[PDB]
């Protein structure tokens, strides 16, 4: 139903991070990428709201977190910009949570 | 991408009122969607299709109740398509 793949996104090909004092660290960052055709539907209903949406998107099943390090760094960079915290999993499911935020 | 119109017979069987069968239309199907956790924005980056009714028609009726007839309103689909989930 859904499909998982690690991919390179415009903003993360490569990713740049700047701290105070202007020292920057760059580096490619692969992201978990879910895609597919979820079963969706919209139906008329009584009362309010008059419509019902079984709307669902292919979302990642978060099971852990990944700390990716940016390699190419300017001299004397802070450590907080040398890493990135990314939610990580292994499979995708049809869920409506991404639509909520 | 396949979002199709589906006919639905729906039975109203509420205590006190006459039973009533209502025939309406709903949208059902499968559209493409993808999503990734953007940590730069610390949110979900979503690009999604959903099977929705673009146009619809209201469907009114009288429910013949023993203690006062009611007037009911239902949307029924006329065109089903894969569109933005958030619009």
UniProtKB/TrEMBL annotation, chain A:
A GO MF term: hormone activity
Keyword line: Disulfide bond, Secreted, Signal
Gene Ontology terms describing biological process: G protein-coupled receptor signaling pathway
Annotated ranges, domain Glycoprotein hormone subunit beta: 18-98
Top-level taxon of origin: Eukaryota
Cysteine pairings via disulfide bonds: 2-58, 25-73, 34-92, 38-94
Keyword set includes Hydrolase: no
Predominant cellular place of this UniProt entry's protein: secreted
Subcellular location, record wording: Secreted
Keyword Secreted: yes
Cellular compartments per GO CC: cytoplasm; extracellular space
Family to which the UniProt record says this protein belongs: Belongs to the glycoprotein hormones subunit beta family.
Protein name: Glycoprotein hormone subunit beta domain-containing protein
TrEMBL record, chain B:
Main location: secreted
Top-level taxon of origin: Eukaryota
SS bonds (residue pairs): 3-51, 17-65, 27-80, 31-82, 50-85
UniProt domain CTCK: residue ranges: 5-86
GO cellular component entries: extracellular region
Transmembrane portions of the chain: none
UniProt keyword terms in alphabetical order: Disulfide bond, Secreted, Signal
Compartments where found: Secreted
Record-given protein name: Glycoprotein hormone alpha 2
């Amino acid at each position: 139903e859904c499909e998982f793949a690690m991919r390179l996104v415009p903003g993360f090909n490569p990713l740049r991070q700047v701290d105070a004092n202007g020292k920057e660290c760059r580096g490619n960052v692969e992201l978990p990428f879910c895609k597919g055709y979820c079963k969706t539907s919209e139906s008329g209903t009584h009362g309010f709201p008059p419509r019902v949406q079984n709307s669902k998107v292919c979302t990642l099943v978060t099971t852990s977190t990944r700390k990716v390090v940016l390699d190419d760094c300017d001299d004397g960079a802070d450590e907080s910009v040398k890493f990135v915290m990314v939610p990580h999993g292994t499979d995708c499911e049809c869920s409506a949570v991404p639509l909520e935020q | 991408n396949s979002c199709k119109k589906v006919g639905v017979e729906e039975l109203i069987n509420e205590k006190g009122c006459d039973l009533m069968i209502i025939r309406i239309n709903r949208c059902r199907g499968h559209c493409f969607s993808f999503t990734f956790p953007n940590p730069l924005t610390k949110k979900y980056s979503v690009h999604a299709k959903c099977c929705r009714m673009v146009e619809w028609e209201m469907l009114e009726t009288e429910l013949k109740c023993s203690k006062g007839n009611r007037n009911l309103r239902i949307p029924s689909a006329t065109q089903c398509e894969c569109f933005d989930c958030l619009v």
